[PDB]
């Protein structure tokens, strides 16, 4: 059916799903889980950032036999950040299963230490392509019991520099391995890989788009000189759990952040003219609730964020959509100078939406 209980998972795994607060299957979960449970390969078109993990980790965990100390399932991802995210979700979902071991290994984890780690039981490996192939070829990661492999964001896994690495990985695995493949896009390389390796895959085309539905949108006619005063008013009236305040330049981000800080606001800031590692650190602290508001440029999923402020109104309708759209939040407020008035109506039309005058 369409309830988690319908999939007849182990009670331990369902308890894991319950404790995640996952009440009803998402559409990608509804489409992926019963087919993957049967053993069929999957070919899925889903956007990046879509909650694919929640779909494929469940049948992966259901497939495990914890009476065996062997690696039995692998998830291959193109970035260190996705590896961390997926392994965390996997560790939480499986926390009732009694002895299930999940390990993440990337170019960003220490190779010596990871090798020592693989001396002990590991059932599930989450990894970047380069690191896991290196580990398999060194004999450290033994993969003759792997019965399932997931490829997440397969287009990035199968780009020019990586296609052979992925091919080599696949050739070390039991020929009958179940494959679950997820991708936003389907270049020739992914098409080739598909044809060679996937076996009559179940096809899923679940492309959730960014939408404005459910987002209340307002604008306020303001001069540039008045913008912080207007911000003062907003943050003295709304209930803000967390907010994101977008500006159109790195210079404006810093100046604003430093200004409102001096005025007693809680904020971090992030923009283009910073080291990436610094950027990641700040964003991670914002997510963990160490400030209330993030001031930033366009660089982009944080549940606590209930208000987005466009302190500078964007030039492009697509930028606007990325700033306040959601896949499937609360309030968006636009500060509009005279010179923004054209883009306001234009972006409104392009996106087929409504941005109402703010209530007094």
């Amino acid at each position: 059916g369409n309830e988690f209980e319908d999939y007849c998972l182990k009670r331990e795994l369902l308890m894991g799903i319950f404790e995640m607060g996952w009440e009803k299957p998402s559409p990608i979960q509804e489409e992926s889980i019963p087919i993957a449970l049967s053993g069929r390969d999957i070919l899925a078109r889903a956007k990046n950032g879509t909650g694919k993990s929640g779909a494929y980790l469940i049948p992966l965990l259901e497939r495990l036999d914890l009476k065996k100390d062997n690696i039995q399932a692998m998830v291959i991802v193109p970035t260190r950040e996705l590896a961390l995210q997926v392994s965390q979700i996997c560790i939480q979902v499986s926390k009732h299963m009694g002895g299930a071991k999940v390990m993440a290994t990337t170019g960003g984890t220490n190779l010596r230490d990871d090798i020592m780690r693989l001396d002990d039981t590991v059932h599930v490996v989450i990894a970047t392509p380069g690191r896991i192939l290196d580990l398999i070829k060194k004999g450290v990661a033994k993969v003759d019991h792997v019965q399932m492999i997931v490829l997440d964001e397969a287009d990035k896994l199968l780009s020019q520099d990586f296609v052979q690495i992925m091919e080599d990985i696949i050739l070390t695995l039991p020929k009958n391995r179940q494959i679950l493949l997820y991708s936003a896009t389907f270049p020739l390389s992914v098409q080739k890989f598909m044809n060679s390796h996937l076996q009559k895959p179940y096809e899923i085309n679940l492309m959730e788009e960014l939408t404005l539905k459910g987002v209340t949108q307002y604008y306020a006619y303001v001069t540039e000189r008045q913008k912080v005063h207007c911000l003062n008013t907003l943050f003295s009236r709304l209930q803000i759990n967390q907010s994101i305040i977008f500006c159109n330049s790195s210079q404006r981000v810093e100046l604003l952040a430093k200004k409102i800080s001096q005025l007693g606001y809680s904020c971090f800031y992030i923009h283009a003219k910073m080291r990436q590692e610094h950027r990641n650190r700040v964003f991670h602290d914002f997510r963990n609730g160490l400030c209330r508001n993030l001031v930033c440029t366009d660089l982009f999923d944080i549940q606590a964020v209930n208000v987005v402020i466009n302190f500078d109104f964007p030039k492009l309708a697509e930028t606007y959509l990325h700033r306040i759209g959601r896949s499937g939040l609360g309030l968006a407020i636009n500060l509009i100078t005279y010179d923004d008035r054209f883009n306001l109506k234009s972006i409104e039309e392009q996106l087929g939406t409504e941005i109402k005058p703010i209530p007094s």
Binding site: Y218, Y219, A220, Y221, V222, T223, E224, R225, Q226, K227, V228, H229, C230, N232, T233, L234, F235, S236, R252, L255, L256, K259, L263, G264, Y265, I336, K356, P357, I358, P359, S360
Partner: peptide, 23 residues
């Protein structure tokens, strides 16, 4: 390029509040 009007000629207190209108 230049330094913003709200940084230089901005408020020196959070209580400096203006009316909100789209009109």
């Amino acid at each position: 390029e230049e330094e913003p009007e709200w940084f230089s000629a901005g408020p020196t207190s959070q209580s400096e509040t203006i009316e909100l209108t789209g009109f």
